[PDB]
Amino acid sequence: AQVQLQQSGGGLVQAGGSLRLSCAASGRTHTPYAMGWFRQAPGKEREFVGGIGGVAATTTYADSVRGRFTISRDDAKATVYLQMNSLKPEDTAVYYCATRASMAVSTSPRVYPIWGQGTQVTVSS
Amino acid sequence: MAQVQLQQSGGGLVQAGGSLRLSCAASGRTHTPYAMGWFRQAPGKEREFVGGIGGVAATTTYADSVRGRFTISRDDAKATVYLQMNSLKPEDTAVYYCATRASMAVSTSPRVYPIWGQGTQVTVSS
Amino acid sequence: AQVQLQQSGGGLVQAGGSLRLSCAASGRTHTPYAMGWFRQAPGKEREFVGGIGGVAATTTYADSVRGRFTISRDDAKATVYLQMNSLKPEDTAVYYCATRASMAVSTSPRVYPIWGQGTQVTVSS
Amino acid sequence: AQVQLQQSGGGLVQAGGSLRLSCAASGRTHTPYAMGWFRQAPGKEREFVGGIGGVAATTTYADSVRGRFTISRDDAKATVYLQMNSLKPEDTAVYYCATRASMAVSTSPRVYPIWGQGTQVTVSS
Ligand SMILES: O=C(Nc1ccc(Cl)cc1)Nc1ccc(Cl)c(Cl)c1
Ligand SMILES: O=C(Nc1ccc(Cl)cc1)Nc1ccc(Cl)c(Cl)c1
Ligand SMILES: O=C(Nc1ccc(Cl)cc1)Nc1ccc(Cl)c(Cl)c1
Ligand SMILES: O=C(Nc1ccc(Cl)cc1)Nc1ccc(Cl)c(Cl)c1
């Protein structure tokens, strides 16, 4: 692979809690390229959460996470973050970052050829 | 005695085009929907608004000169607000301050914020 | 009410993670005086965690936290910090700082007349 | 290439004042590896100030700073701090942090391949 994505920072929190995930990229990195966050809960397909792309770090969000989750990036560290607030039990899933050779963010996981390892996030009621 | 205390971290010297993350950790009677504003001040210059975050939905606002380069976010449970800087320029050199007030509305005037961080130096070499 | 201690910095940490607590002193402060750190889990008495005192900022630690926790102090801010690393569930507890009119760090809570209000630290695994 | 360190927080202080420097590590970090602090005044070569290393986080100090300066570590944030107290004008210098692929602390700058950018510190009369 041209690029390797290493994820950090999940765990188990109570409803209303916060977590921050990181996705550190190494290899032939290019920070304007799209980084997507996707999650997969038990029994479900990979659902798009949000993405970041472009020379100006523009973000886009799924309806179910807007306002609560925030995506950012540190260019010099080649790292993209997913800040999660007001967490809900329904947010429980394995979270993945993924990237592709385009600035454009897509909702389809299938157009991202490069995947991080996944991080479990679990939210108690 | 203040009702809230702001403790700033991060900063330093980087090259033009570099990146930094600044942190502003709030303690005491904290209420995370209240506005947190970032201001900067370079030696011999007036204070100026950088950007801010506020509201239940974490709405952000920025000065024109930093839009597309700086991003503000918050971590409610750590009661901490971050200012992510990318594509840094010599022009961005200054002490950076966070500030807060008992209102969700982000104001661009420093006068309306009664509570201040201690500042952190950011130097961007030419 | 000769010196008062305001704590900061508690909360939920994931197993293996880190947290810094703060204890700020106000009033007729003497930074060479001993600041003790103690914790209490439900169903146990306040047990000594560690402490700092003297002009040289000498420290001492309970066996179970040595290597993992560091105490330090900032004289101009009249603040003492508890840096905690490699946190595990056994560390979950309400954590207190305390002081006394003496440079000697005592392991007994009874000889400290000044207490901070305490903060909860919860670790899940 | 493998780890970067970013230093924070220089500045002016009065004699008798305190200051806290940070050294944030990023990349393929290993937190028990040795991080040394050095200082250099108007061209004199970097003299050792202190270091921290090992699983149990052991600290070592130069004679000229012991007691007054303290080093600690936050493993979660891959950051090392140097807290400075009772500062005096002879402490005026550029301070650096450095790291190496070994737990062992050494007093020689040479054996640390990785260098922070340096922070100025100035202490007045
Ligand atoms: O590098 C990246 N994305 C990326 C995005 C944000 C940050 Cl901070 C860092 C890296 N993508 C990339 C690079 C090369 C190829 Cl071939 C492909 Cl297919 C993708
Ligand atoms: O608490 C805050 N702001 C704040 C904003 C964001 C975060 Cl993550 C955390 C805290 N302000 C506040 C609170 C009380 C008073 Cl009196 C005043 Cl005057 C201001
Ligand atoms: O001041 C302190 N402790 C203290 C410790 C560390 C720092 Cl950084 C700052 C302050 N104790 C004190 C002071 C006065 C009295 Cl009467 C008594 Cl009874 C205790
Ligand atoms: O990681 C480190 N040091 C370090 C020290 C303190 C903390 Cl909190 C975190 C990290 N060194 C390192 C790591 C890799 C390489 Cl190749 C080299 Cl050459 C050095």
- Domain extents in chain C: 1-125
Resolution of this model in Å is: 1.9
| Residues near B35 by beta carbon (within 8 Å), at least 6 away in sequence | B52, B53, B54, B100, B101, B103, B104, B105, B106, B107, B113
Sheet holding C69-74: strands in order across?
C3-8, C19-27, C79-84, C69-74
Chain A residues near residue D31 by CB distance under 8 angstroms: none
Chain A residues near residue C15 by CB distance under 8 angstroms: 11
Count each helix (H run) and each strand (E run) in chain B, helices first: 0, 11
Contact partners for chain A, using 3 or more CB pairs closer than 8 A, are: B, C, D
Tokens of C88: 């595990």
DSSP 8-state symbol, B66: T
The span from the CA of B81 to the CA of B59, in Å, is 13
CA–CA–CA angle A104, A120, B23 (5° rounding): 70
Give the closest of C68, C77, C83 to D18, CB-based.
Answer: C77
**CB-based contact, C8 to chain B, within 8 Å:** yes
The span from the CA of C22 to the CA of C79, in Å, is 7
Q: Does ligand 4 come within 6 angstroms of the Cβ of D111?
A: no
Ligand 4 atom with the smallest distance to the CA of D73 is 8
A35: three-class secondary structure by DSSP: strand
Q: What spacing in Å lies between the alpha carbon of C22 and ligand 3's midpoint? A: 14
- A81 HSE (CA, 13 A, CB side): 21
Experimental technique used to determine this entry: X-ray
D residues 37-66 closer than 8 Å to B (CB): none
DSSP 8-state symbol, A22: E
CA–CA–CA angle C102, C105, C107 (5° rounding): 130
Tokens of D107: 């007093």
The span from the CA of A23 to the CA of A7, in Å, is 4
A90: three-class secondary structure by DSSP: helix
Tokens of B30: 């904290």
The span from the CA of D10 to the CA of B10, in Å, is 11
The span from the CA of C91 to the CA of C26, in Å, is 28
**CB-based contact, A14 to chain C, within 8 Å:** yes
The span from the CA of C39 to the CA of B48, in Å, is 44
Q: How many CB atoms lie within 10 A of CB C60?
A: 16
- A31 HSE (CA, 13 A, CB side): 21
Burial of D55 per CB tally in 10 Å (0-12, 13-18, 19+): exposed
Residue closest to C75 by CA, chosen among B12, D68, D3: D68
Q: B36 near B52, Cβ under 8 Å?
A: yes
Beta-sheet pairing, A69-74 with C119-124: unpaired
Closest-CA residue of D relative to A8 is D76
The span from the CA of A86 to the CA of B32, in Å, is 12
Closest-CA residue of B relative to D22 is B10
The span from the CA of B14 to the CA of D26, in Å, is 15
Q: What spacing in Å lies between the alpha carbon of D96 and ligand 4's midpoint? A: 15
Q: A27 near A2, Cβ under 8 Å?
A: yes
B residues 92-121 closer than 8 Å to D (CB): 120-121
Q: C21 near C95, Cβ under 8 Å?
A: yes
Q: B59 near A67, Cβ under 8 Å?
A: no
Q: B58 near B73, Cβ under 8 Å?
A: yes
Ligand 4 atom with the smallest distance to the CA of D34 is 5
Q: How many CB atoms lie within 10 A of CB B109?
A: 10
Closest-CA residue of B relative to D20 is B9
User: For residue B107, what are the β-bridge partners?
Assistant: none
Q: Name the amino acid, one letter, at D20.
A: R
Length of chain A: 125
B92: three-class secondary structure by DSSP: helix
**CB-based contact, B75 to chain D, within 8 Å:** no
